[PDB]
């Protein structure tokens, strides 16, 4: 979907010959959704407040419907609600929220959560209505900067092991988001790892390391770990990746309150376990615009953090080089307790050109671009696509 | 690992978006500068051999388009809030010079004036007219679409450029469609995925 009004099918093979192109009359595009899991009928939203329903076929498409929304208002964004219930949430500028019952597509609470630079809010839907559930705005001088939620994950391993078959039980709580606050004159990049349901903070980590606030900073939320990156000076004027890894118990063998036979914990109430964390950071040569995570259908391989730089270059570095609880490698030498083949902490990550994708391509991504990871089969391989001003994949 | 499938597997598209300004080049006369996709903090400036889709280089510069002007050529640009100005060389985008004291000079870029000189489209079909002796050389059908002629070069390395449809763009030379371009793909906001795919007991034994 273009920023203008146009949809079109691009082939992932054959060097992206245009499979088909359809023109709208919406005059700017905001979002795309498959109306059902069948992947046959799209709904596409106007900037102006119309929506179109389009029939994707091997033939050229047909506009099977155009219609207004309930109120002809300008729309800021749309958040995908349930596949089965066929609901959507629309955030209008003027900060007005609309529940969206689109079509048949021919207690049981739902929680949905949205971010602005003014704050992080949270919202709950009940009884065909939306209600504010809480609010968290930063103060005047402050400004929320970077945000990410927890992408859902298919589960392989409930715990990270040690050399002597001992287990640390990586922390798996699904209702988490993480975010940044930057405050002027404090020069304090504050990191919070917030329960996105309730609002409890669980973690604070500041850095009075002379941040810049002028270079990009970004946050990505992993399987059991979080990475956010910023630029600052006091260690050195260099790009900085910070990794925090969330564990049930820092003790070598403890499953803290995770028995699951029939306990059936409640997040809404707040009797959940709370993690302990271990954090490290690293020294990086080049300024980082934006980060995301590789995937396949099953979260098997190393999750292979992908980075997009200022120059347009892309680079992937594995998850494993970013090991919190790493050691500076004098104390690892037959230190049996650490891990199986623990790669050391090694804060200086030099750039290795072998990693880089777009080997000699330019790939001007424009001011606002996104990285996405498209799963495939053949789990050694994954698609990562850079959509925005320029399109690119690999 | 990479040398075998270096360009085979990697798959890049370059988009410029709908043109706003196009300026011929001081040297390599089958070449211009392509200005496109304005934004409130910056715009897309690139260098391009006219006789292909071969983009020579691209840059995002932090100026609204109106600052970008020729000299009194040397493609002068002047910030308006401050007095900051950048002089960039057309052929190789070298920042000839910078200042804040004063802009060197400016010349607002001229309008097309292509009609009354080189253009006539009379029988639903285009004819290039010489300014004198209007013999209607190099005539060409109007396609189903036509919005504008972006550019035309009458010199020895002849080239003509048409905004035929809103998003389709055709290059011509001495008529023959010489190359084809599409810039509907210049900015995508949101994305979705569609995949493709292929296409009692005793009787069971025998069948």
């Amino acid at each position: 979907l273009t920023h203008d009004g146009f949809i079109g099918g691009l082939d992932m093979v054959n060097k992206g010959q245009l499979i088909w192109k359809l023109d709208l009359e919406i005059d700017q595009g905001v979002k795309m959704f498959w109306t059902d899991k069948n992947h046959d009928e799209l709904v596409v939203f106007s900037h102006d407040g119309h929506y179109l329903t389009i029939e994707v076929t091997k033939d050229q498409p047909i506009i099977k419907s155009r219609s207004p929304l309930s109120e002809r208002k300008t729309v800021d964004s749309v958040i995908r609600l349930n596949e089965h219930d066929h609901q959507y949430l629309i955030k209008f500028e003027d900060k007005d929220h609309l529940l969206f019952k689109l079509n048949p597509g021919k207690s049981s609470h739902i929680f949905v959560t949205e971010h602005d630079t003014n704050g992080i809010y949270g919202y709950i839907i009940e009884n065909d209505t939306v209600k504010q559930t809480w609010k968290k705005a930063v103060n005047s001088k402050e400004k929320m900067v970077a945000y990410s939620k927890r992408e859902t994950t298919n589960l392989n391993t409930l715990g990270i092991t040690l050399g002597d078959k001992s287990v640390l039980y990586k922390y798996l709580y699904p209702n988490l988001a993480a975010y940044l606050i930057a405050n002027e004159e404090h020069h304090t990049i504050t990191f919070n790892l917030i329960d996105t349901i309730t609002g409890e903070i669980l973690i604070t980590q500041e850095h009075k390391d002379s941040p810049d606030f002028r270079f990009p900073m970004d946050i990505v939320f992993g399987e059991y770990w979080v990475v956010y990156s910023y630029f600052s000076s006091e260690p050195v004027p260099e790009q900085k990746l910070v990794v925090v890894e969330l564990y049930e118990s820092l003790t070598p063998d403890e499953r803290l309150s995770n028995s699951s036979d029939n306990f059936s914990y409640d997040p809404l109430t707040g009797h959940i376990n709370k993690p302990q964390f271990q954090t490290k950071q690293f020294i990086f040569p080049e300024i980082i615009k934006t980060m995301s995570i590789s995937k396949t259908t099953d979260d098997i391989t190393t999750k292979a953090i992908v980075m997009e730089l200022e120059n347009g270059q892309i680079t992937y570095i594995p998850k494993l080089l970013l090991n919190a609880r790493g050691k500076p490698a004098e104390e690892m030498a037959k230190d049996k307790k650490k891990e199986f083949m623990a790669t050391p902490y090694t804060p200086v990550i030099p750039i290795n050109d072998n990693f880089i994708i777009t080997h000699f391509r330019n790939l001007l991504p424009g001011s606002d671009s996104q990285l996405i990871s498209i799963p495939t089969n053949l789990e050694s391989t994954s698609i990562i696509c850079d959509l925005g001003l320029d399109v690119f994949c690999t | 690992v990479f040398s075998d499938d270096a360009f085979i597997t990697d798959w890049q598209l370059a988009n410029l978006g709908p043109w706003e300004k196009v300026i011929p080049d001081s040297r390599d006369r089958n070449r211009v500068l392509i200005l496109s996709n304005p934004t409130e903090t910056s715009c897309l400036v690139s260098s391009f051999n006219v006789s292909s889709g071969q983009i020579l280089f691209r840059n995002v510069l932090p100026f609204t388009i109106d600052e970008i002007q020729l000299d009194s050529n040397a493609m002068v640009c002047v910030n308006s809030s401050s007095n900051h100005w950048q002089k960039y060389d057309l052929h190789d985008w070298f920042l000839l010079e910078e200042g804040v004291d004063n802009a060197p000079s400016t010349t607002i870029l001229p309008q097309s004036s292509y009609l009354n000189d080189q253009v006539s489209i009379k029988n639903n079909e285009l004819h290039i007219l010489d300014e004198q002796s209007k013999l209607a050389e190099w005539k060409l059908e109007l396609p189903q679409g036509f919005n504008k002629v972006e550019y035309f070069h009458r010199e020895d390395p002849l080239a003509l450029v048409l905004n035929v449809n809103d998003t389709q763009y055709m290059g011509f030379s001495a008529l023959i469609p010489v190359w084809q371009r599409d810039e509907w793909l210049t900015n995508v906001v949101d994305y979705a995925v569609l995949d493709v795919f292929d296409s009692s007991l005793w009787n069971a034994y025998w069948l």
Partner: antibody
Amino acid sequence: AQVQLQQWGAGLLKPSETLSLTCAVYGGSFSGYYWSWIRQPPGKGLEWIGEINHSGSTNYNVDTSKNQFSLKLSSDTAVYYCARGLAGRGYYGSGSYLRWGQGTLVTVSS
Amino acid sequence: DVVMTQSPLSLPVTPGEPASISCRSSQTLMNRNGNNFLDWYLQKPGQSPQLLIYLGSNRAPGVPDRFSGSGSGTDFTLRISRVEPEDVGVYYCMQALQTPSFGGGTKVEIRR
């Protein structure tokens, strides 16, 4: 018709004041076209040429926003259209107005 | 300063048939290159104007094949191959040499 225009205004203005309407662009190729208004008085008539260019080309019977691509004009009752005109000639334009504005209705009354 | 006049103020024509509508101007329309700079428009009620012909006899993009034009000098003509009931509304002349005014008002009246 994809690249189309949009109109702003106010519903009532008194007699004998300049009349503010503001266009808006959601499509490309601003520089290279002449952008004009049209009045359609009810009474089976239409007349206006106030065409303009990215550089000042004011020519009345008109402000532009190259940042926002929202052209603007402040001068009786009529229906008021934005438009999009070709720029064939050098500083004159070449008429041929297509992909019209969708219209404001103006009742010039106290 | 050019004043443009449409010959038929009302033209009742049965569905199906070819037809033509004429238009005249005070001055001459003829460019040095050979362009005439006279355009023909359609307006169905409840709609913004729609362009039909852009040089008096050519056709602008996104217009059916049925329509065509002719003429030069001070006089110009629209002409439809086949009339159909959909093309109902007022039809307008326009000159682009200087100060277009939209003098016209051909009101096709296909109801005899």
